[PDB]
Amino acid sequence: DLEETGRVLSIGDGIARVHGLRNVQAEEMVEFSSGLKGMSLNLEPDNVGVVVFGNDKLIKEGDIVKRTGAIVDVPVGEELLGRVVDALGNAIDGKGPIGSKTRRRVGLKAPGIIPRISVREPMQTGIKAVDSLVPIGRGQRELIIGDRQTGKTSIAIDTIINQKRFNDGSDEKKKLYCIYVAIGQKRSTVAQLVKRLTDADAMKYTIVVSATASDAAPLQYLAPYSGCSMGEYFRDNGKHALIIYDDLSKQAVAYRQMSLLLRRPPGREAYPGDVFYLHSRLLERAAKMNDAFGGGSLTALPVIETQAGDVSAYIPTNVISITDGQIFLETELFYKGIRPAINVGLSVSRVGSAAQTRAMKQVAGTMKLELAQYREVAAFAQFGSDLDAATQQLLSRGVRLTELLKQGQYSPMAIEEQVAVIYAGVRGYLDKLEPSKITKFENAFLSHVVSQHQALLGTIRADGKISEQSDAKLKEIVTNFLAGFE
C-alpha cells in the first residue's frame, strides 16, 4: 500500500486546492485523510482543484490527499433493484450492502450512429393523454417540463407504477426496469416517494438514486450519471430501462456552483460554457440498440422546472433542444380541473405514431385531429351557442374528449382500456351525454368492460389492434352500456 499523495494548499466552499498529485488524471477520484472523497476537476500547473464529496469542515490545510487511480465508477446490476442508493451507489436504506458484481464508469460515451435502430416500441405510461397524444417510445428522451407543483413527479410515478403489469408477466421483451434519480429533493420527499412505490409494489423493479438537498454539489452533479450507468447496464444486456431525472434544473444548479467556485468563466445566468455539454452527454446515452447489440434500450424522462412558464431560460432551452419532445404542464389547466395538467397544444413527441400500438393509433389519430379543431375554435366558447351547428359540434366533441383525458393520481390504465375509452369518445358515443357526467361514465363503463368483457380486452391486448370483430364487439358493448346508463 504505497500511495501517491498531495497536500491541501487551501480549502473553502467545498473546493480543495491541492499541491502535488503530479500524476492524477482529469476527473479522477481522490481520497482525503479524513476519509472523504473528491474528484479532480481542475488540473492546473501548480495545484489541482478537487471537489469534495462531503463536508469541508473535515478538511484542513495540510491534509494528505491520496490518489485512487480510477475515474468515478458505480456498482451496476440487478442487485440494485429495490434499493435506495446515493450518487456513488452506497445503500442508504439500511438493508445491507449492495451485492453487485459489476462496476461501470459514470462517464462512458453514448452509443454511436450505427449501434442504433429506430424507436419503434411503445413505452406505456398509463396516462391517457400521454399514451394517446404525446406517445413515448423505448429509446426516446421525452422531457417533462413545467412550473412548480404542476404534476411532473406524478407523471414519472404513474409511469413507474404502470410497468407492474409487464414486470409481473412472462413476456421478457416488454419488461421495463425503472430508475428514479432524485436530485436536490428533501429526504422526506424521497421517503414519501419510496413509500408510494413500495405500496404499489413498484420497488422490486425500481432503483432510487438519491442525491438530496443537503448533499454536496458534486454528488448532486454526479447522481444523473450514476443512474444513467445503472440503466446502461440493462440497455447493454438486451433489457429495457427507463430513467427519470427529477430534476435536471437542480443538477445544472449544482454544476454551476462547482464551476463558479473553481473560477471557471461564467456565462449567461452564470452557467459555465459547458452546461449544454453536461446535459447533452447525459441525455444522448438513452438509446435504442439494434438486434446486433442485444436490442436493449434506455428511455430518459428528464424533468425541468420552468420559472413562470419561461421556456426561453438557459437550461430549459438547452434541454428542449436536446430531447425528442416534451410533455408541457400548465398550472391554469391544473386549477381548471384538467388533471394531468398536460397542455396538448404545446406538448410534442417527435417519435410520434411510431411509438404507438395500432389500436391506440386508430383511436388517437382521430382524437388528435378533433382536439386540434377544438383548440382552433375553443375561444368561441362563451358565445358558441351563437354560431354554426358545425362549430357547436366541434366545441361539444372537444369538451367531451377533454374530460375523457382527465385521470386520477397513482392509477395508470392499461392500453386496452385506454383504447376502449378513446373509442367510446371519438366514435360519437358520448355526444348525447352532458359533460358533467363523462368522467363518471368513464369510470362505470370501465368497470363494465373489465368485469364482463375480458375477452375483448384480452383480444385487443393480444392483437395490438382493433380488428373488425373487435370493432363491432366494442360498438355493441358501448351502445348497450350507454343506452342502459344512468
Partner: protein
Amino acid sequence: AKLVRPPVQVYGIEGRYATALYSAASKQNKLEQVEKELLRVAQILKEPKVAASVLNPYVKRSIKVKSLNDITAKERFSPLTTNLINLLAENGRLSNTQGVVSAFSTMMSVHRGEVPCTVTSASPLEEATLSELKTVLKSFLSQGQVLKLEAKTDPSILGGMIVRIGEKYVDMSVKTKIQKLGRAMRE
C-alpha cells in the same frame, strides 16, 4: 531561445526567476557557483539595515538598485548572480528575493538527487532502527539518489510509522489500522 528547464518546477514569481536563473546557469555550467552565491546573497539580504532599506516602499528604485549594485560589487559575485540581483531590483521584486533563492535552492535539492522523505512516529525512535530504515528505504530509489530523513514524533498515532518518501506515502500507523478494522466491523 530554448530553455534548460529544471527537473522540478516552481511556480509564481519565485518559480519564474528561479527557472530563468537555473536555465542561465546550466548554459554556462556554473550551477554550483550560482547556488553558493545565492545562499550568500540571501543571508546578506536578511541583514536588518539591508532588509529595512530594501523593503522600504518610498525609496526610489534608482537609489535602491544602485545600492544593491554596489553591495553586490562588494562581494565579487558571478555575472549571473549580479545580473539576477539587478533584474530583481529593476523589476521591484526584491521582496521575493529569498523566496526566489530558496526556489533555486530546492531546485538543486533534486539536482543532487537528494530525495526528501519524512518518517513520523509516535515517540522518538533510536538510531539502530533508523539506519535499518536508511538502508531498506534507499532501495526505494532510482539511479543515484540519497535520502533526506526527518524523523518526526507525534504520539497521537500511538504506534506504527507514517513514511512520506518524496510524494509516496505509506501509512503503517496503528490508528489507521484499527480504524480500518473498525470500518470493516461497521460496514
